[PDB]
Amino acid sequence: KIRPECFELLRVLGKGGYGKVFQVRKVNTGKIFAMKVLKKAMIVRNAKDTAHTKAERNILEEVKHPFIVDLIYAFQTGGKLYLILEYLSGGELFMQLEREGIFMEDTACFYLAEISMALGHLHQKGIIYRDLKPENIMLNHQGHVKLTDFGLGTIEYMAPEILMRSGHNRAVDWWSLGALMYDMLTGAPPFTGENRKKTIDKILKCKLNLPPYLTQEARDLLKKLLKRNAASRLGAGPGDAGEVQAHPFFRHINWEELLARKVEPPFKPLLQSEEDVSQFDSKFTRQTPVDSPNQVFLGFEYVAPSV
Ligand SMILES: CNC[C@@H](Nc1ncnc2c(C(N)=O)cccc12)c1cccc(F)c1
């Protein structure tokens, strides 16, 4: 049986509006895991919210893919829900950008390539990732990507139709990718505003500024992704991911190798222990790890067939 007590809290890894993520140890004894904690009390009052929260618990169980994060255990108490994920000691791709600054082309390429297979798998399953801001991506302990966010921030990477809530499809993912790619290559997201509205209005007017040092392939791709008309974006077509991956910017990518994780990451986190936490923001990792003190979430319980 699985209850909160099977695990001891080692660190705080992140803090969301409806909850936290703890690094924990299973007391698989000794194995480290990330424990994501959701307060039901904030969730069950909003239909659209419990939906997103159950969508998340289904998707994580259903999908198994090298570049999406795995659900090990899941479980609930009176007021909390508990997800136990593999622990991704590479941290967020956000912090990887901070760490190494603007990425070189071949570096940017690798991460985008992995991310593109991820999106491609998801789409086949009818799943849209919506938002591809670098904090919604992490790196496992070997330095490869893991999409990690299917539950319920900044908006700069979201596409127009999404923001204006005018109705969309999987192509918003391909817009969001070109904004990610921009940010990796330039160090900023393509449309930023002095504040919120400035930024949305800037995203709508959608006037792309390409820096002079971008290769021709980099520019071309970026142009075809960051198109206002979602139909016109590369990857909008029936090809989806294979459409984007075919573009020349990716001409060095041997895909079946990449998926096998046979390609060396551009940067290897070198960790010193299983729960080395050096790849995480210390704003969080310093805090004292403490879990603050009808049911529709029936049957939340999960145990991966693996473990
Ligand atoms: C990355 N987006 C933020 C997300 N944090 C994580 N999500 C899944 N796994 C993680 C792991 C890990 N499994 O290794 C390690 C550290 C953080 C996360 C999130 C969302 C809502 C409320 C939260 F508190 C946190």
80 C-alpha to ligand 1 centroid (Å) = 16
Picking from 121, 103, 125, the residue whose alpha carbon sits closest to that of residue 188 is 103
- Active-site entry in 70, 106, 131, 281: 131
Q: Considering only CA atoms, which residue is closest to atom 23 of ligand 1?
A: 16
Mapping DSSP to helix (H, G, I), strand (E, B) and coil, where does residue 82 land?
strand
Q: Which two tokens stand for residue 259?
A: 């998926």
Way it was determined: X-ray
Backbone angles phi, psi at 106, to 5 degrees: -65, -25
Give the separation between CA 120 and CA 258, rounded to whole angstroms.
14
C-alpha closest to that of 297 among 58, 15, 33: 58
- Does 36 carry a binding-site annotation? yes
- Is the distance from CB of 116 to CB of 300 less than 8 angstroms? no
From the CA of 32, how far away is ligand 1's center (Å)? 15
H or E element: which one contains 54? helix 47-62
151 is in an annotated binding site: no
Question: Smallest Cα–Cα separation from 292: which of 41, 29, 30?
Answer: 41
Whole-angstrom Cα distance, residue 101 to residue 187? 7
Which of 163, 178, 236 has the alpha carbon at shortest distance from 210? 178
Bridge partners of 7?
26
Ligand 1 — pocket residues by CB below 6 A?
A: 13-16, 19-21, 34, 36, 69, 85, 87-88, 92, 135-136, 138, 148-149, 151
Catalytic status, residue 49: no
Question: What 3-state DSSP class applies to 226?
Answer: coil
Output the CA 194–ligand 1 centroid distance in Å: 28
Is the distance from CB of 212 to CB of 166 less than 8 angstroms? no
Structural element, H or E, at residue 37: strand 32-39
Q: How close is the Cα of 21 to the center of ligand 1, in Å?
A: 6
Listed in sequence order, the residues at least 6 apart from 126 whose beta carbon sits closer than 8 Å to its beta carbon are none
| Resolution, angstroms, 1 dp | 3.0
- Amino acid identity of residue 70, one-letter, is D
User: Residue 229 contacts by C-beta under 8 Å, 6 or more apart in sequence?
Assistant: none
Residue 15 assigned ligand-binding role = yes
Looking at the DSSP bridge assignments, the partners of residue 19 are 38
